[PDB]
């Protein structure tokens, strides 16, 4: 739970920072809104889930989680500077802003949720949050870089 408060809170920041992102908001907004969805179920477990023993594995997941977040938050933060975005799109740093995160951040929930199902016995679904972040991230990536180029920042 020690990490949960860091993940949930960060889930709000990653969401607040992305919500206020001056660039690539399309994907950014998703990262946070999607991230929030990952912290959402926890809110029912960690907050009102009646107890929650953070085993060595559980904490390790939430650890990877809280850390994985810093990636999204860091990616959204490092991208906050338009100078970085404009130079990342045309240059294509990684083809997608927080793709590596949706990729790492995702696996975390897979290990965090699957662990919780054991430690807390809480029923979970295949990332109900919608692990399609990557599919939309790239769709918005190739579209973003190609959008801001000459198309109005929709």
Please name which of 37, 41, 40, 19 lies closest in space to residue 28, comparing C-alpha atoms.
19
Q: Are 92 and 110 in contact (CB under 8 A)?
A: no
Q: What whole-number distance in Å separates Cα of residue 74 and Cα of residue 76?
A: 5
Q: Are 116 and 85 in contact (CB under 8 A)?
A: no
User: What does the DSSP assignment read for 12-27?
Assistant: HHHHHHHHT-SSSHHH
Q: Are 24 and 85 in contact (CB under 8 A)?
A: yes
Please name which of 28, 4, 16 lies closest in space to residue 88, comparing C-alpha atoms.
28
Please name which of 81, 73, 67, 68 lies closest in space to residue 16, comparing C-alpha atoms.
73
Q: What whole-number distance in Å separates Cα of residue 20 and Cα of residue 11?
A: 14
Q: Are 4 and 62 in contact (CB under 8 A)?
A: yes
DSSP 1: -
- Decide: residue 142, CB within 10 A, 0-12 exposed, 13-18 middle, 19+ buried: middle
Determine phi and psi for 98, rounding to 5 degrees. Answer: -110, 45
- The experimental technique behind this entry is NMR
Residue owning tokens 């990636």: 71
> What residues have CB less than 8 Å from 78, skipping those under 6 apart?
84
> What residues have CB less than 8 Å from 149, skipping those under 6 apart?
89, 90
DSSP 45: I
């Amino acid at each position: 739970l020690e990490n949960l408060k860091h993940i949930i809170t960060l889930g709000q920041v990653i969401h607040k920072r992305c919500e206020e992102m001056k660039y690539c908001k399309k994907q950014c907004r998703r990262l946070g809104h999607r991230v929030l969805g990952l912290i959402k179920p926890l809110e029912m477990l960690q907050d009102q889930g009646k107890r929650s023993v953070p085993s060595e594995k559980l904490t390790t997941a939430m650890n990877r989680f809280k850390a994985a977040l810093e990636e999204a938050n860091g990616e959204i933060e490092k991208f906050s500077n338009r100078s970085n975005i404009c130079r990342f799109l045309t240059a294509s740093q990684d083809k997608i802003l927080f793709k590596d995160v949706n990729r790492k951040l995702s696996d975390v929930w897979k290990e965090l949720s699957l662990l919780l199902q054991v430690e807390q016995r809480m029923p979970v679904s295949p990332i109900s949050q919608g692990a399609s972040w990557a599919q939309e991230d790239q769709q918005d990536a190739d579209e973003d870089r190609r959008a801001f180029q000459m198309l109005r920042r929709d």
